Amino acid sequence: NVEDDFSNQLRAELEKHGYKMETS
Amino acid sequence: PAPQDVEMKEEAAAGSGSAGEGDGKAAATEHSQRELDTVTLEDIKEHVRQLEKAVSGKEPRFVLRALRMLPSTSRRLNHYVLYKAVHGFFTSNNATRDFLLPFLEEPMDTEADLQFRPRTGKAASAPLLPEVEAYLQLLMVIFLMNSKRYKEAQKISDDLMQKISTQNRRALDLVAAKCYYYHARVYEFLDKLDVVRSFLHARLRTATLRHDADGQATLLNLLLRNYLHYSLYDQAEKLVSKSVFPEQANNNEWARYLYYTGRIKAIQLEYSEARRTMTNALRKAPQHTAVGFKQTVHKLLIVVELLLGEIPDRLQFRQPSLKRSLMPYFLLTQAVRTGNLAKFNQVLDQFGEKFQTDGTYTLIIRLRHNVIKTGVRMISLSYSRISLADIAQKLQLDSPEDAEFIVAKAIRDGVIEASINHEKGYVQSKEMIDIYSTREPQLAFHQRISFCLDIHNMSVKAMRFPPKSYNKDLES
Amino acid sequence: LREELQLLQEQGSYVGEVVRAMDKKKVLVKVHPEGKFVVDVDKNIDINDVTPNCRVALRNDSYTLHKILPNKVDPLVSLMMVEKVPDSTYEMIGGLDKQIKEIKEVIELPVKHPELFEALGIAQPKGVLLYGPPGTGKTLLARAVAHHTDCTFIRVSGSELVQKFIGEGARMVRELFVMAREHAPSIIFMDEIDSIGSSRLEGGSGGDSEVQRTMLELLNQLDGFEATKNIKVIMATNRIDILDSALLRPGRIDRKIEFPPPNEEARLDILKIHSRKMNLTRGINLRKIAELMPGASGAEVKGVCTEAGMYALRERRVHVTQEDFEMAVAKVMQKDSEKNMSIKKLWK
Amino acid sequence: MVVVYLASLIRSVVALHNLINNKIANRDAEKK
Amino acid sequence: MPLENLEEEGLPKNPDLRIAQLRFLLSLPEHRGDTAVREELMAAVRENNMAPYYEALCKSLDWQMDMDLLSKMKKANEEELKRLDEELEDAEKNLGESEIRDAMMAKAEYLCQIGDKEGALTAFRKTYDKTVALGHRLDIVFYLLRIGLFYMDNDLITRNTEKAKSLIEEGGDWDRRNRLKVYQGLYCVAIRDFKQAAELFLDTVSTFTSYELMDYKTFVTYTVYVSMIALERPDLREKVIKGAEILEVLHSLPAVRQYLFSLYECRYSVFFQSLAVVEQEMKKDWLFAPHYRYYVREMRIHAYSQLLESYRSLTLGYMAEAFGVGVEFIDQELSRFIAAGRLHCKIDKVNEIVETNRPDSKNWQYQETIKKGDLLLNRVQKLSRVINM
Amino acid sequence: IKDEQKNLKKEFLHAQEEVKRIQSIPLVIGQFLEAVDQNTAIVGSTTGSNYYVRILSTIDRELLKPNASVALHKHSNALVDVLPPEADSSIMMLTSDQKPDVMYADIGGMDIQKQEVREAVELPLTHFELYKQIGIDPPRGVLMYGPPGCGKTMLAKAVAHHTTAAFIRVVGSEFVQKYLGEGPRMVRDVFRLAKENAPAIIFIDEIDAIATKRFDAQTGADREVQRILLELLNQMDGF
Amino acid sequence: IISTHLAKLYDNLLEQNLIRVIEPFSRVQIEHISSLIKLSKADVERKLSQMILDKKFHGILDQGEGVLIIFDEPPVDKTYEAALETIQNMSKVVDSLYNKAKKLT
């Protein structure tokens, strides 16, 4: 909805990990 | 002595009464009268008269000096408020509110329409009797929980109030319609297993032939509450279904009708009809005077909208300044978003004491289903084809079967609106799009316009009525 | 609407003018392009109910007078408008106290109360000469008093353009006076620029100055209007050498009002008023602009501001660059400074 | 519909109290 | 100058930074004399890790205020208030043109520095009315405005803004105008809206004076990020890279420009790298809202939006590769956006094909008409009953 | 009363039809002179007759008052309708037809002058919003002066092809005298068409007989030449 | 001078090459656009993505076949676009009506 920033932080870190291995 | 007790309380009620009773018998002036009644009359009597020159005060001096000594339980409730033969639950003021000294000061002076107590000792010489009995009774019922009177006084305005107007003309019902309403707000407050119903029902049927829609409305509200106390679902179910609810009755009373209706239906899992009523309820209520009812309605409202499969807005909980009380309700909304059981179940218990008080607790148990349900519909709607395994992890479900069973209950109702294909094990959404090469939009619009239409004829019609009542009324 | 079908038919209805009413119980109305018509008195009028030079409404079903029209256009207002004067007040020059105090003395007191001059002795103002170059805001003070007094300030720029009642001077004394007198008071502001002719500058030194001499001498003497005069003929001119001796005459001129050529104080005041509307940028000083010019004219003073704003517009910046004010004052300055050595002008 | 109703809400108290005084006045006024 | 304090005070506040950050925040009040403003700023935050004092919370921030800092704080706040009292008194008696205008002025750099509202409310208002050098008035009104932002009181700030608005066109100094844009913008973020704030912000970038502002490098990076939350990819992207902004500044934009560039290029792979670097540097140093959701959410949809516009169908396999973020994460991020109605695509994950509904013709619009209609109708049904009775 | 109201609706149409005949042609053209009331008004016609006229309800009466063309009946006496100030114009125009043997591009010279024309002619057409925004004390007319053949007119035309905007040759040749009071009226017409037909420039080559120093005006023809000048000046203050 | 004109030229050239490719073929092959423009298959699709967004030929690139489609698919239409804005505005008006309406109750 709104007040997303908190979860967003967690989303960003995990996503990076997934982002390095997978990327072309 | 206190000159404030006498001049304010006797005059204020006098103007109001005369003008309504007289106007109502004469012509249908009803829109104008309703606007006066809710906002001005209730506020003025309640707030300012408490702190005068004497302790308390609603209007119990117009039920003491244009009483007319009626056969009503206006006098009976009066004796308790002052002292005539019994002190009652509230003491008398010797600052000239006395019932111990009757026939003290009057500023009103003669005029039959105005009411006057030493002009006549009985009103039983005309068909006026039911409306003036109703009027004084009205003043009384509002005050009774206010000044912390209990026991006998509440019960003789539940069965006996009903006895006073059951034989009526249109005018008489219209004054009595009010009288029943101000009784309704005290009635919600104390629960009884005692059956007030008999009189209420029997009077409902005879008055419909007599005329007056407003009287019919108020009795339906009173009656929903009677079931609530008993806490029997079945009896209430009969009453909501049968009724449609007409629109002639004031705005405050509609809000009470919607709140009660919304509350009961949702338990059954009829979240759909109930949400509509509750949302209308909040909005229907008055301003600052309403505030205490409004907060209870605001607690129920998040729960009924949450039950549907919606996740209500977070700002809403925040904004009224009952934020604190609203805080568990917001947490329930968050638990529904994530789909986790563990937060939802622990909150329900901890805050359970606070929920029971509101009356919401019965609905809150049904919300457990929603926690998982909202999550699966959100994910499927967004991305159509997802494996059964993926939904199980997200919600914290037992199995891919556990998810499939949620989808099975839902589909027939239409909530989740998807289907399980165990061809490989996925849930597949029904969804497609390109409705404008099919006739189907003309229907969507067609119902919307039909619905609007009946209201348009009503809009033109109602609009003109109140300025015209005022022009017909004589003014200085 | 049904009834409107019948109502609309007539033989028309006009707006006519009553040249004179007549004490014969008939009234003479002349329709605007068409000749005169005599028609009887109506119920709606008699002869105390219509008096000379009243434009009227007519029912043209007999040319008979319908009602007297509540609209009646004044030629003095028209004149003031077509030429254009932007009104102003004491503030604009403000701080040269003696200068504003003097214009009030001459105009304001003998129009409002004629009694004050009756006591003083001297005939109420006939010729008041305001002379000296423009750009000192000489016109602007005249406007101020004329508005307050509720006299119509009718501007002549040297032209018999704004004489339309026959359209040649010397009859611009008589017709102009009668109209002005009728809708009185009036302040006739005759600005004698005298840029007309090349054979009118040998007739008096201005076509307008010939007119003004006619008007001055005649009006002083006329009827009781010398010490009962209230339609002032106030004169304005650029220089004192383009006048007639007749105007310069002390017995015709009650007061004489001297203006210096453009000064630094006047130029500071004009720049400041315009800067409020203009955009600015840091490091602009109006004092340098005011100091450099020698000035000469009414046109020039405001023109510096106009030119600064225009130059910024051609650039497409919405701040007024520091250089814009410099360019505007420089070009204008350069023309004016040149003139005392050799003749030139700002215009052809 | 809203506009009229708002005008009505302020007018109401005034108009309804006054009615009783004018009513009495009318009956007596009528006779002469 | 006092603006430097808010940005530093943002630094402990935001969730990309915390404890160390108080030592730097503390240094600025001793130097400027902004000491009263800092003390005031602790109350405004209402605890999000702030308050470095030996007076209280010694190990809670693990930084503390100094002894010289304390005596100086008291000395500075009292001197300004002391002067104010006498000047207010002496000023009334003499000339209204000259004396009062000067007296208020003399106070004013100092009065904002302390941030004292009460002394300010009376003194500030008197100066403005009386005309003088027009540029001067504008500067002064700006100090009045700085005090109100510190508290985060809605009321005081709105009140302050209005006097400046009247004055700015009057002077017409476009340099001075540009300052008013920054103050409004801080306040606009303060309530919630970056969207309002963004519009003002873009204008300020053109002409800039660093007086009553912090620094030009700090502001340009702010402007490009705030513009971006409001504006879509085509126009903002062209202005920052192809225009003047990176060349003149001589590099401080790289984080925000990288984030826009990926959209333009249609290589999403850079977009996902750019998010972390911009978040910490540019967005989160802010007292007025270090709230990532507006920024982050708007940018994530803008990235998807262009990809959806360009093809009716795509594979998952292509989506996953382009972004470089995983298959699950891309679905998860999408789940909010589709449901909210920012976007309208679906992923048929198990078969690895994505179908996209196009934004073209009557159909997309019909879906839309209905959405506005349902709520409108709902409000209507309530309205019809309430007015009628 | 219910059925009656429906009946009355049919009468309104019947009535509307009947009136409509009266309402149309013969229709004379006036100018809307002034308003005495908002039920009857004064309009001044083009044979010079001023008329006291009724306003026929089939238009508004709040969009009635400006000075613009209008219609009045001869003898069914109604201000039947209102018409734009655009109507009433006998002046021709060549936007860029019979193209001059010059352009801004087809010269390079008169560079010093290229700033002076650019500012005067071009800027309000292209972007008036910029003009408004700076704040200035505007001049009435703008004057270009030099000796003839110095390229002053040439250049104003040259910019006009470069901008792409209409041009109107407005000169004493365009103005027509043959009836008394027709001459000043023609001046108003040109001004009202120019403002309607933006972007455009009205250029006067020789105001050498539009404006003369002598007005005898004891002769009908001489009297019109003075009127023509008066009107030029008053419309020009507005423009 | 060079920066601006070279941008016009590059863009123009892309535009010329593309118009001839769409005009007689709908679902035209990727090899055919690669060949006319004189680029590699990956490079044209990328650049095209941007162009679609600007809507400078009113087509769509279909990835699920790897074909480019040009069809009449005009953005919105005039009645509905204006109406969408009208329905939005009404929503604010009904809200205002709700505030006003409070006073009755």
Side-chain angles (χ1 to χ4, degrees), chain C residues 1-2 4-16 31-33 55 57-58 60 66-67 69-73 81-86 160-168 171 195-198 200 274 277-279 302 305-307 309-314 316-320 331 335 345-348, chain F residues 11-16 18-20 22-23 33-37 40 42 47-57 74-78 115-116 118-119 122-123 126-127 130-140 142-143 145-148 152 213-218 223 225-227 229-230 233-234 237:
Chain C
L1 198 56
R2 296 286 281 275
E4 194 168 299
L5 307 177
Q6 306 167 46
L7 302 178
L8 294 173
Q9 314 315 117
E10 298 185 315
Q11 299 164 98
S13 19
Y14 279 61
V15 163
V31 169
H32 297 205
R55 46 176 53 196
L58 293 172
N60 196 86
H66 166 58
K67 51 168 174 55
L69 206 73
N71 303 7
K72 163 59 174 192
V73 298
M81 287 210 169
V82 293
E83 205 48 274
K84 189 167 188 291
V85 277
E160 292 59 70
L161 177 60
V162 306
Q163 177 62 1
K164 24 166 179 67
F165 311 132
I166 180 178
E168 41 176 42
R171 286 281 299 275
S195 202
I196 191 165
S198 44
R200 291 169 179 76
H274 290 37
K277 49 173 176 53
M278 295 186 72
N279 281 127
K302 51 203 205 77
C305 319
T306 300
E307 281 166 68
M310 279 186 190
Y311 298 157
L313 290 175
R314 162 175 67 184
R316 320 280 163 110
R317 298 171 182 178
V318 282
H319 65 82
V320 182
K331 184 185 179 186
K335 294 174 183 162
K345 283 296 192 307
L346 308 174
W347 299 304
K348 192 177 191 178
Chain F
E11 284 171 17
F12 195 42
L13 312 182
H14 186 55
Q16 269 182 261
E18 294 179 285
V19 92
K20 182 67 195 183
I22 319 163
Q23 176 194 314
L33 212 289
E34 184 164 72
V36 67
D37 299 272
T40 181
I42 309 305
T47 194
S49 310
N50 199 344
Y51 259 52
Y52 176 82
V53 75
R54 187 186 185 284
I55 308 156
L56 192 304
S57 306
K74 300 184 184 191
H75 311 271
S76 311
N77 192 268
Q115 282 63 243
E116 295 311 297
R118 273 192 304 150
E119 190 189 271
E122 309 192 31
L123 302 184
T126 198
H127 290 292
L130 226 302
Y131 223 98
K132 191 60 165 65
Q133 189 165 258
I134 212 68
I136 0 176
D137 178 304
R140 291 59 164 170
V142 288
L143 185 55
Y145 61 71
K152 82 177 80 61
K213 276 177 172 178
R214 179 160 282 185
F215 293 125
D216 293 282
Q218 290 201 273
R223 182 66 161 91
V225 191
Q226 190 177 253
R227 294 175 165 165
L229 183 59
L230 204 277
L233 287 184
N234 58 57
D237 305 314

Side-chain angles (χ1 to χ4, degrees), chain B residues 12 15-16 18-19 23 31-33 35-36 111 113 459 462-463 466-467 470-471 473-476, chain D residues 1-2 4-20 22-24 26-27:
Chain B
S16 195
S18 190
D23 283 313
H31 300 305
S32 284
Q33 302 306 318
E35 288 189 72
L36 184 88
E111 168 72 359
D113 299 80
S459 192
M463 172 181 156
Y470 291 119
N471 310 120
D473 295 316
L474 312 152
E475 296 186 67
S476 47
Chain D
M1 204 193 199
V2 293
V4 295
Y5 267 90
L6 260 66
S8 292
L9 195 280
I10 67 169
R11 173 171 31 171
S12 205
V13 57
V14 175
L16 295 169
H17 286 77
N18 289 344
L19 176 70
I20 326 166
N22 294 96
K23 185 174 31 162
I24 306 168
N26 276 97
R27 60 178 60 120

Side-chain angles (χ1 to χ4, degrees), chain A, chain E residues 15 269 272-273 276 284 290-293 296-297 300 320-321 323-327 329 332-333 336:
Chain A
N1 181 244
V2 69
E3 312 287 309
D4 304 285
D5 184 348
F6 315 92
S7 59
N8 201 81
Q9 292 178 236
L10 306 192
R11 300 185 65 77
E13 308 175 50
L14 308 171
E15 275 183 46
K16 291 289 180 305
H17 311 330
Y19 171 75
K20 290 170 176 317
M21 289 190 288
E22 197 187 66
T23 192
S24 285
Chain E
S269 192
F272 207 57
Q273 292 182 148
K284 288 192 184 166
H291 296 157
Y292 211 38
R293 70 296 297 224
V296 73
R297 191 182 181 110
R300 288 175 165 175
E321 167 275 300
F323 275 68
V325 200
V327 308
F329 286 107
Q332 285 179 117
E333 283 172 280
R336 292 180 300 170

Side-chain angles (χ1 to χ4, degrees), chain E residues 80-98:
Chain E
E80 172 43 52
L81 282 185
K82 162 173 57 192
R83 299 180 290 213
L84 188 134
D85 293 323
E86 302 165 288
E87 283 178 285
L88 211 57
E89 192 72 86
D90 304 332
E92 85 202 67
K93 326 194 198 181
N94 302 310
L95 300 173
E97 187 171 307
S98 307

Side-chain angles (χ1 to χ4, degrees), chain F residues 100-121:
Chain F
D101 299 284
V102 71
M103 210 193 183
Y104 192 71
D106 302 351
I107 67 183
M110 299 177 69
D111 298 90
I112 67 299
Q113 288 310 300
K114 272 179 169 297
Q115 282 63 243
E116 295 311 297
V117 72
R118 273 192 304 150
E119 190 189 271
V121 175

Side-chain angles (χ1 to χ4, degrees), chain E residues 137-383:
Chain E
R137 291 182 309 149
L138 269 60
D139 304 316
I140 293 155
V141 63
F142 301 156
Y143 306 133
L144 169 52
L145 197 21
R146 289 313 296 106
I147 294 148
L149 291 156
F150 292 130
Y151 293 92
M152 297 152 110
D153 278 357
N154 283 92
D155 309 71
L156 181 54
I157 311 157
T158 296
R159 187 202 85 108
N160 295 355
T161 302
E162 308 189 69
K163 301 182 212 288
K165 202 65 187 172
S166 304
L167 266 62
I168 52 169
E169 270 79 266
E170 207 173 326
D173 300 273
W174 273 71
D175 333 287
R176 293 189 182 78
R177 277 199 187 173
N178 305 123
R179 293 168 185 192
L180 176 276
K181 289 302 174 183
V182 182
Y183 306 122
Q184 296 180 327
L186 305 165
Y187 179 42
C188 284
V189 175
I191 56 184
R192 162 177 297 249
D193 278 272
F194 279 92
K195 317 294 189 57
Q196 287 184 337
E199 296 319 283
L200 314 166
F201 269 137
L202 203 161
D203 303 347
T204 331
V205 82
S206 293
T207 303
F208 196 94
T209 28
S210 288
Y211 174 37
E212 299 181 41
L213 289 172
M214 183 182 158
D215 190 55
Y216 173 68
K217 304 187 159 177
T218 301
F219 273 70
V220 306
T221 49
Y222 291 177
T223 304
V224 184
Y225 103 70
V226 64
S227 286
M228 222 164 39
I229 314 175
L231 275 301
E232 303 183 7
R233 102 83 172 103
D235 174 43
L236 194 272
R237 156 51 186 75
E238 283 295 289
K239 189 175 165 300
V240 68
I241 295 193
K242 178 164 207 171
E245 297 199 65
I246 74 304
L247 310 319
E248 75 196 289
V249 173
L250 218 69
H251 298 313
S252 191
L253 288 297
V256 72
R257 54 98 61 79
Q258 211 183 124
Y259 196 25
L260 42 107
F261 196 40
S262 43
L263 312 181
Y264 202 79
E265 286 194 288
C266 196
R267 58 174 291 183
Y268 299 127
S269 192
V270 164
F271 177 92
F272 207 57
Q273 292 182 148
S274 307
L275 182 156
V277 62
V278 83
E279 178 178 0
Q280 182 166 278
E281 300 182 2
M282 294 220 187
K283 170 86 177 69
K284 288 192 184 166
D285 325 294
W286 274 44
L287 192 262
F288 294 90
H291 296 157
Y292 211 38
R293 70 296 297 224
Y294 310 100
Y295 190 14
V296 73
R297 191 182 181 110
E298 280 271 282
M299 292 299 295
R300 288 175 165 175
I301 54 178
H302 298 332
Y304 280 123
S305 192
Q306 176 167 353
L307 186 54
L308 303 173
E309 165 67 34
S310 309
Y311 310 87
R312 100 172 51 204
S313 268
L314 305 98
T315 45
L316 177 68
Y318 174 77
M319 183 168 266
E321 167 275 300
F323 275 68
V325 200
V327 308
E328 202 187 65
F329 286 107
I330 276 167
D331 281 74
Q332 285 179 117
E333 283 172 280
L334 273 166
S335 193
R336 292 180 300 170
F337 308 152
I338 313 176
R342 305 299 196 255
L343 302 174
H344 288 300
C345 74
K346 297 85 69 182
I347 289 174
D348 286 308
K349 203 178 166 67
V350 204
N351 282 33
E352 322 176 62
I353 68 292
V354 321
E355 163 183 300
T356 287
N357 183 240
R358 300 200 56 86
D360 273 300
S361 300
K362 297 184 198 295
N363 188 247
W364 174 70
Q365 311 184 269
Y366 193 82
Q367 194 178 129
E368 284 192 273
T369 58
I370 287 314
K371 293 189 291 183
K372 295 188 187 296
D374 282 282
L375 58 118
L376 176 55
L377 189 61
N378 191 247
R379 197 52 53 88
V380 157
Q381 51 167 255
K382 203 288 299 181
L383 283 160

